[PDB]
Amino acid sequence: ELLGSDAPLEKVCSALLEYESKRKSNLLEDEQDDIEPVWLQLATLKFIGNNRKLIPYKIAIKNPVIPSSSEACLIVKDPQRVYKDLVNEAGLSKVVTRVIGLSKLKAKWNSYEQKRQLRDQFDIFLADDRVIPMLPRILGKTFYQKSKVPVPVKISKGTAEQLKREVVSAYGATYFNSAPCSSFMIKCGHVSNTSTELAENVESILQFVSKHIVPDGAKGIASIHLKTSQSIAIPLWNNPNLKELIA
Amino acid sequence: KKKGVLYVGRLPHGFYEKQMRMYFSQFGPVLRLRMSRNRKTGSSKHYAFIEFESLDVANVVAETMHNYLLYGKLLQCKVIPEDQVHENMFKGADVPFKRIPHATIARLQHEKPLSKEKADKLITRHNRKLKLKKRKL
Amino acid sequence: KFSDLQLSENIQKAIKEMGFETMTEIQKRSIPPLLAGRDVLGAAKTGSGKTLAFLIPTIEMLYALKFKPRNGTGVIIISPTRELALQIFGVAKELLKYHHQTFGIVIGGANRRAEADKLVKGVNLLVATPGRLLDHLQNTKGFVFRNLRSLVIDEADRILEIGFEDEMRQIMKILPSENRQTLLFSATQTTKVEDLARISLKPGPLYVEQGYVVVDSDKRFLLLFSFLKRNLKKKVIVFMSSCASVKYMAELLNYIDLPVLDLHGKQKQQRRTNTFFEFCNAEKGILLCTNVAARGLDIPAVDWIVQYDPPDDPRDYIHRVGGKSLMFLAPSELGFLRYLKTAKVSLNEFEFPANKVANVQSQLEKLVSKNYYLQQSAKDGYRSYLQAYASYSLKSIFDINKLDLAKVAKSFGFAHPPNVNI
């Protein structure tokens, strides 16, 4: 339903997961908990974006896509000591490995060699809203092209329980960088998550999609497909009355 | 006498065709100036081919301006012998790089509605795209 | 046991604090005749309490005769390698904590100019290796040893196997033989061992699956650090070839928020036992120790056994294993695999990707450079690592000359190799 009264969720997610599981066919020192991502591609009747908006979309969802064991790096405003103290007393030191001030990020990381070294060190880069416009520079294509876009995590007030709620919010919510196109792809999860969660992660994405990125909502949506990096783009829903909408 | 072509690599960002022309002119005449630029956005590929009026002066610039510590970059200025120089090695030299905004052009295409028949051709094409997957699954 | 033994109050008080008040089978058959002064020719397995077997009666004799540093050395203990000697010296420091008899250790690779300066002050309890003791016996003026009364040989089979056959024969002539107690000790009873006993002991003696990783030296610690981070929730025990190396690595890993326990402690036997017992009790954890420290101790159910430094005794190591086994093998040491082929030991090769190695080297070097106690521990861990390597029994396998020192010190946290003598 939802989009055009024909969205066949649940069953599609189970079928896709079974299809991916069907395609199953030393490394003990080369093993981890990596699971193939679940990919949701959306087709729009018009180019939603005017230009590449180099900030992620905080698509809230209670099923995290980033594993909680991932290492996070906080990019905060000066002074660095205050927020270093904040993460110390809030018990996020194990979760957030490093806190980087903006001045120290602009000075100590100027070469691309240093930028790539920093990028590989951590998995997700959390950034304060107060300074996220800088991170386009100072970081460059070494970040905003190799799937490393800093996230605007709201830490302006700077309180212990506020840090916990934003880090949890950042970890659980899937992320996507908007670019000028009629088509884009969304991270929904991995094969590990059960099919019911993916279908419910998916529906949470479209309702957010119909609200804050697509201006006209389901009317402007062309088609919905579900894909895995090496699998078929199974269509969740196709527009049944798009003929006169584009006319 | 024979034109002296200078490969200037590791070009600091900003030292572009106009800027190279003014700087390299002081050493000697630059018949034409060609800098490699990106496929789409035309951003510098950081190496340019500067053929001077004579090999002799180009040799002077190659010696003077080799390993030049410019903006934290060691400039590489080599006289490339004519044997490796080809006809289009200096193609489009001193010709402005009119970056075609491909992305917005397709955005204008997106804004431009197809002709009603050609729009129906798209709808059927989407129907073909719909039935092409039909036996695909 | 300990209470039954007639050791003096200081020896008894130290023994209670140092360890337990029991008496093992090897000790029970060795303390009585050694205290009486009779020659003892024992044959005991490694890690069976032999260190205390020839220490408590010997220290008691030192107190009984009331030796003074102006009387020179009254006891010499011979050990084949530095690691075994250092463990003995560490235990002897605990035992002599309440007495007044000076103790000291002379081993190869140490400071000869400073070792001789120690000797001329009188070292009433001397731990030594055959290679260096002969040098100090024949070439140091001021070393008083004519008042010697007790000679102890530890692991005579390994001494003869490592290549000290002639070194012992020379030492016997210089060392006094009249009214001197001797105590040979070797599990093996080879004919050459008997020959050494005949030339040294007095007549009428008292008779008693594999897995390896090929990693270059420069990334050895970085590979280990990433591996430990990946397996944080498992029971991991790592063996090393130096007590100085383990002290630094545990100190370094505690610095970077990777809490690891160790059998090193503070060279306090009670603390080492407490750490080992707690580690056995805990279902999850990580511990670093040496082969000698783990020698004689029952290995608990551990998922990963990591041999970060090559073992000193490959003959014992292959039977030592008999979760999963690991071997940090260097490209220059691929010949050690051929030894396992000669020993008929099954093995498999483990591969790692260069992308996942946690390249914190620039930060790791900055920590050691900035900190003082880290730098000294790193410097001493690096020095003891090389000296153990140069003292390995397998010259054909572990060639120090074929080793690259620049890559080794990169793992230890140095941009450039420190200046250590040999």
Added chain:
Amino acid sequence: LKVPPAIAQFQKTLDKNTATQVFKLLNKYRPETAAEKKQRLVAEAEAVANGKVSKKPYNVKYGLNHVVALIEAKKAKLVLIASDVDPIELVVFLPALCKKMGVPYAIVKNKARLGTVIHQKTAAVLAVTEVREEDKNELASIVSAVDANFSAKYDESRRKWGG
């Protein structure tokens, strides 16, 4: 006469651009003046008298004995030798010592330029052993230029008798 190779190697100094870049980095790590240092000490002295932790400094190392001991310590990342020491024996071994101990070195123009950096009339030699993390790239870029413009260049000319 015919100048020996060890004394002729000083006539091929560092060029215009690289020396200007080298001195630009040095001038960000100049030592602290006698007049300023007193002001910093009386500020700290006054703080402790009324009522009462710092960070290690970062300055270029100077002095012949101090620097030569820094080369032999493998601590100096860049050694800058004046080209006009009046008794030339004072630095005649410095290029060969730097070659032996694997240190990037350069022979720059005038002791006064090195002297100016450290608020002295004259400096025979200057060494950079540690820089702030913000300027690690700048020192690395300069050292590469010294290798390319001084060590890669000449090279044979320092083994040939001069004059």
